[model samples]
Target: TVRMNAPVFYFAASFILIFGIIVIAFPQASGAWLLAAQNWAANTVGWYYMMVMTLYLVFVVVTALSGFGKIKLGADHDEPEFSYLSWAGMLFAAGISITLFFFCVSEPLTHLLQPPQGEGGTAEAARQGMQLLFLHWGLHGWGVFAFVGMALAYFAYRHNLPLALRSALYPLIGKRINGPIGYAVDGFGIIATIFGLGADMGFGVLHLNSGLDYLFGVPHTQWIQVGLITLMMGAAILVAIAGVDKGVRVMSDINMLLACALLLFVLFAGPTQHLLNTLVQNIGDYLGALPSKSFDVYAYNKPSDWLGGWTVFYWAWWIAWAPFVGLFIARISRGRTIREFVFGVLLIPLGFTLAWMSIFGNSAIDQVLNHGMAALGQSAIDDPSMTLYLLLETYPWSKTVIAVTVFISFVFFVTSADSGTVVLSTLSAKGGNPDEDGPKWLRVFWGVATALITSGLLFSGSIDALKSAVVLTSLPFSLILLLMMWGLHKAFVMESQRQIAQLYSLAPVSGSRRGGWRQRLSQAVHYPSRDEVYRFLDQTVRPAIDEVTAVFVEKGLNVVNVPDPSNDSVTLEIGHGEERPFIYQVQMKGFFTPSFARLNNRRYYRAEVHLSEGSQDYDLVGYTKEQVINDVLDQYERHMQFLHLVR
Candidate 1:
């Protein structure tokens, strides 16, 4: 039954996707639909963005709350099989790392060069335009992830279904979707995610190589590409062998920490006041403009092929990630409520994405505002890798930051590729924890295949060709997503009906006190009590305020702590002041789950921060507290890069 269903589902999905693409590719047809949708969105649903945003938030809250009651990881409820924080970290590694790092800087800059229609500005005027950059990259771009994550999580967690990418459609598909249909769905997802992800990895490597070439006069050649591919492949294979527990989880924690450090360094070292103002203003602009932006079709007097190339490409890329992301989400979502799965997978990440854009986007915008978009445009043209290179050049400690950034990007890609290996293997596996032990050889095979495919694409030296391949993959996946949507709806209805019937069946006997007592007893026995741990730092640990001074004094670790009387949080130094190595610090808010606490203490995380010495201690800072932490950690990691501490 399973085998038969697989081909059927694949054919159906493929057909729909091919048909849709054909229609969309027809310029006239595409324009009509695009213009129509834009008109409706602009007129009646301009604020529809608010609805989407609200839904995202609601889903996240629901998922979190539902998790309190629903998710269970272990047999007999003895103990959780995975830590929520670790699981979340793994999800980040799998889902966003490849795309986020590349896009954080690139996307906003791209948007600055090509403002969307109805956004009321010329591309020239919007050059290094922080607000425009934020609108494209921040709210609108991240929104799609939230939508898909919520849908996938809701079905996988709440419906007691397998958490494969295809399982997302269980709501529409009915139980008959179990076998081949599921495999095909998962296969399509893998293809889409792998291609898109590889493209991202390729871009990262290309950019890093370009940065190196520009900074140190290293030649950008086939050797660089081969070296990066070989290195990433080796790392991916190693991570795969290490498995999810040691590999994905650990890498994710470290990546997050590194990312935080990078953000922090930029915040401290860059134009602090400018970044802050840019962040606040751009965030507001993004929010205010989000509604129109969501459905804008770039249909001004002159159409924007650039807008379509960037925005549409992003949407398609995100959709491509849906399968891998959905499957990963499903795996971690067992015992979670429908609402909880949707929200956590979707909303929280969106917030994180916005902050990411704020840091990188603000930096790009600041450059454009100060230097003019000519440099950015030239960089984009001369080398698509210009964003990171430009950033490195602007920094005081260019060499160190460039090397660290390149290293971090490499690790980030490794985590992504490793997760892809696991995900693909699980999709092909016959049974057992999809996240747990998959066939080792299968992972190795996929790793090699991906490496080959990506290397070939890179050698082709045509991003357009790579994009076409992605589009081809996406065409099929789109059908699968639609099927999933339908399947999920059907499943929900059936479950609701079953529950209703079951309730009615018990209704007649419920009037009796004996029956009521029995029900109460059953409920009490079946539903386990829940408890969560929240940590409070010891008073002796030094409030973030005084700790800066202490850490600064103990400078062998290269700690450079700066006091800001005006700001509530103390700034950690990066790149050491002239005489001392820079140490970056920022106050982190939010309660850390046990696993997160463990990971943080493990010190696998690292990145860079840009800080400024402000006048009168009242000067504003650029990066968020999280960014500062990431940057400091990145710097710290570089200091210890030779140690290989985790291994």
Candidate 2:
């Protein structure tokens, strides 16, 4: 279980309940208002979404390539818990499953039927259509996710802040992020996340209903959709109770494996040659058109409906979904470097997404134009949910594939709900420990609440209203995202300054030591045990800190020495009033002895120094009392230098 943060949880929960009731009670009015507002904003402020999205894409790419890319998402010693396969699979499952399946066959075909500028039903239309699909789902969307994830993870892990949206603004607002402003930030995140997820669940139910009706004669009724939501919610709650590593990870892996099998089946089954050719050509087209497509608002061109419907719609969706999806990504991406995280998130799943659309989308396109299946194209336009099954009908083993498709959709639905439960619980829970995902009861509560909201919206025909509300909510969240970028950059600069100061302040290893060269060499080769390190901490480290404290105390400065024998760590802190204090912490850190050493001991302990920022990645195991004092002074001087530079 986890500690609860009352303000954010209660506020967000109250609003969601009230909003759900209002939407369910006054479905038409709520839908009209939200739709009108969303349409108006899209028509008027389309350029803003385009430009901000471009900024996000550029920011992440630039950060990944810059010196800042070397920074780790967690502490200096942390390593990624999940393997690359697990990470990528979870990214695919949690980020986009239902949406991808819903749109794969339909989105490209619909655009091919009637593209933005060109005539419907032509070679040029098909090319532009797939390229545009790439634009909407490609780097533009993932970049927003990358940006949000990087910000949240960096602050929470590197700076020891809470894993919340408010934590990303620490550089701009400092400790006040724990107060009302912070609550509002997280509250809005919860609001946007619940609504966004509710809509996604509704989509899953509709499509699953279609698949079931086609396969087993399940009625396409509101009652059936409600039943589907309840059933999935129960499964999700069970998964939530099982937690991330066991339940969520397994489900995500299964989702990815099934998805890959389905993708390969489609690739080989229909128009393999054309599909392969389209894959390469689609990549070329998307890259070539990316610049113009990123900024295109149809200022000179007509048909603004297409712009609002496809481009603007996706931008809002990605933004609204960013907090939950991004937070979930950050949760799983602990201990990765910034560069690894950015490209991993941007490219890994992106490759699969592109391949999927290319295979299924192009196969559908080829069937419609070259193989005389125009009805397939029209079905994508009219009944989008049933379009995938219709496409499967043209292949071998139609019933079997459709059954698998229904099962895929059902699993995806459960994955989304389970992942959403984890994220929602995290946002409501207190504390900044990245390893812990929130409480089990809270996870079940959020899971049930989300399912109820989705069902209510579905029953009252207000799912569209939830979708439109997400669009509007994303507008304000976009501003917070911009601030997050600024804050992250500011923190990076401060870190860089600290690094530069440390470079100048590093004490000579040999000249300042109390022992001879022989003693130092012997200590270096020795694999010290935990008992030896702990003994050194009490005897040498404590005495050294007391000596320094006497001098600082005489200088009229506030100082505190904290010894946590439980963790085998001792800290010496020099407070600087309102500024960040100088921290000299010596913790017993364990590392595997080098293979070259050929030692019987598997691990060795070192008294590693940790500053306010993070670990210094050096040891004081061989140092005397005088050497320890010298080391502390060296770091203290570096801290002062950094403070001066920042000032």
Candidate 3:
């Protein structure tokens, strides 16, 4: 029975929605006014968006290349939870999707004819077109996701902070993160996810509607979109409601597979050799131009500058999507080092992005410019949704290719919506528990609301309108990002000092006492039964901690026995600050042994030592009480040495 931390989240949700209703009710007026506001915003703060996104890329890149790259998001002992390939797949399916499907062909072809900051409809525009498209999808955008994701992972996993937006700011504000400002910050994240995912759902439905029109001659009308949104929302809701491992995991995995199939099909069926050549050339172009383009704001600008429309809008969209994607990125990003995270999520995905754009963007432009297909260019202007479909028609088995694309688009849509539900619900949750997943009902609420919001506003306002909405939202949210970076930096420095104080000063101590022949043989080939683990915990671990408790009690130190939540073991905690807690917890861990005819199906349990970082793998399967006390004393001595290094 989790609720929004405050009525603020619900209120914020309702306010945005009712405003959406107003837009739907009076489409012409609302869209015209919103467009006017959006245009003014782009003109006023477009440079800010450009500069902020550029700085973000620089920051993450420097951090990755510098010593900070060696830092762990969690403790030194922490290890990654997901496989690298699985991590990359989720990054692709969740981070970029139907949006890529919408933009890949349209952006390049449109930019080829009309470069964002320069001359239009020329060969030079075509060359720079690839550069601009890559800039929008590459490190500049992914860096935003990576930075915010890294910040969240660092704060949530390293310190004992709730995995919420407010927690990212905890190092700076401390417990104030549990107050009104905290609710507002988290509430804003919820709203952004709603708008971002709603906008994406609208775009994905457009793909579906356009595909149906191309395939079966169904009329591509707003009414058709309205119906499609309803159906898509229903399906997405079912997937989201079923929870993470059950639905999103499977659906997103399928989305990645289908995407690969389409990518492979296009690679072989289309202008194969030409696209491969273009991909190689485009990668070089993007890399060479990256530094210059990152800061390009057209200082000596034209009044009708298109930079605001393309580059600025792209930065805004990526930043707007950051809150949602950042949370999901952090959720699965635990235990990874900063360098690995940057390499995996940002660089790897950017490579795939380049390939994707190379296959579709370059091919689309080449098909129109070199293949006698002017209709392709016209599709960019008249209906961007039809660009990919038109591009595919030039290939063998055009219908089948387009059909596969539409299927991928649908899965991408569900995947995005499902992730939106999880991220938003996490933000909507109340209270202290870091791992309390919000109410199931809350996910259903947002999933349905996103569909309705898209149905209503999109039916009236247009893709351009939703695009504007994201920019408007991003302008405000970028301020939050700036502050978050500052907070993250401060947290990192403090965490470093804490680690130095705890790691470097540890005095040398002999590892295990009472290491005799029996202990050696047992460690070599011992699989302790559950009863053995319980006995060790009772006869050895308990008495050892009891000895410490007595010593600390006699000295009047802030130390006492604390019970572990699991049935496996108990703990004794000293001191109480979130960071300063010197906790000694012994835990019972269990695992199955290798199959053998003599082995029963029963699991082996071992008495494992737990630390702030996590549980250790090796355990005390068999140990005498005297040996256990020495082990405990040795750990205390090491801790004291580490603690002395804090200064």
Candidate 4:
């Protein structure tokens, strides 16, 4: 069982409970307040939101391009647990949510009908509309996730810190991250996480309700929507309670497959050639104006109310969901380098998003422009939830495709809610063990609370309420994101100092034994079997470590030695309080000896030395006891040099 952080739990829970009650009980009045509040926020700090988001994207990109990119998220010796294909697949789902299905048809159609800067429903309007759609779905959103994920992963995996938001501020606060300040950071994280996830759930219910109405003549009423949320949130709670780790992944993968099928149908059944042309043009147009578009706050020739409704809304929404999406990214991205994480997060999912937006967005545009179905455009503006279904109406096997879309939305909703429960619950819990989860009861409570919040938001003003809540909640959290970046930077500089200290050192890593050319050749040619390597570790490596450990103990230094006999490895460590610890480990690794080699056995093993940063890739098989002791001192001296330099 996990301990709950009392301050964080109460602070976030009280706010969520109170706000949920006010909105649910007095929907009309709360809706009015939310609207006024959203307007004030957007008009006041709309530019701030836009600028911060752009800064986040730039910071992540530059971090990847710099030398710091080589730093791994975990210990240097740790290899990736998931293959690239698996990582990218999970990442693609995490980056996307139910909103894309809702907006793919609506956003492009709405933009074409009434673009931010152009006349409605013209050819130029079509091109500009697609570009704007691409901008909203492009790098800026992923940048927020990437920055947050990279920071969280770097600190949690690299430094043995808790996988919590407060952990990200360690460089700035030290142990104070476990104090009131830490509680407050996580408190805000929980609130933003719920609201962020609530907003998506709001969108999901809206889409599901519309699909049911279109399919079965069900009434699109408040009661119907509430029922849907109850059913889906119940499913989420069940999954959370059971802790069906495998089931959740299967659900996500199945949803993605279903979504892919729908996308392909549209690409083929619609004007395929037209979508192809627009896809190319959409990418070019988006890239061409990315710089200007990124910073465009509509200062000179602004629309009467466009900035607040669209761009500012999107920026806030993405920021609100950053912690949720960011945490998910970090969790699945262990053993990855900073460069790999950033590029993979930014580029891989981006390709899929572009295709999805282009095929659905362009095809919807074609329906309105050439096919003389102008109602589709209006539906995009007024009833965005129904837009995708309406677009499917123009295709062959419309009922079949509509049913499939409904099923995909349902799966997405359950999986998203289930994920939200785990994240929010984990944030509220005290422990930061990356391998452990929050208490089961906490997970169940969060699942229910999230559903309540979504219901309240829906009852209040439907889509407008969801947008307002996100905009209001994301402002203060954005400041926290900036501080996280600073913390990550400070950590990186410290790491660089250690590396520089190692670079300038002239210490030799070779064993004390003097070897001629023939000895060196013999050592390289010999292929030791597994048992031989294990024997070398036990007889020679163990004695050397014991001797070094005895000297350290005599000098009154605390040292720890751990042995993993099963894996044929041992580690010696020296703690440095808040600073990174010194670790020297050795493990046996197996390899296939070349067929052309003169060795009788096809397989060989070696006991390789490992430091905190990673492996030294040298063998200790042929070293005498004195030589082995000398080698440890060489490594230990290098570590001390690093500590002194960093200090």
Q: Model 3 scores what on Cα lDDT?
A: 0.74
lDDT of 3 at 193: 63
Per residue, candidate 3 scores C-alpha lDDT tens digits across 370-479 of: 77788779879878888878778877878777777777677666777777787777777776566667888888877767766676657556777877777776556777
Cα lDDT of model 4 overall? 0.80
User: Which pairs clash in model 2?
Assistant: none
Supply candidate 4's per-residue lDDT for 412.
68
The residue-by-residue lDDT of candidate 1 on 1-647, one tens digit each, is 11123353344345435543454345454434444443333334223333333344343344446423343323334433567777667666665654555556765555555555335125444533556555554544444465566566555444455555666655445565666666566566656766776666676666667656766778877877888778768877887776556665677788888888887888899789877776676667666765565555444556323443444555556667656665555555555444444445555555666677787766775676566557665565445665666665777888788878777777777767776777666665555643354567767766765655566555543454455445445656655555654554565456557755665444221113324665655544221111110111122112433544465467664544444663323455545334434433333233223453341332221111233332111111222333333434544556555335533
Task: For candidate 3, list the clashing residue pairs, or say none.
Answer: 113-121, 501-646
For all predicted structures, in order, the TM-scores are 0.63, 0.76, 0.76, 0.77
lDDT of 4 by residue, 456-483 (tens): 8887778888888888887789888889
Clashes of 2: 0
Q: For model 3, what is the alpha-carbon lDDT of residue 375?
A: 78
| Each candidate's clash count | 59, 0, 2, 0
Off by over 4 Å in 4: 508-647
The candidate maximizing TM-score is: 4
User: Best candidate, lDDT-wise?
Assistant: 4
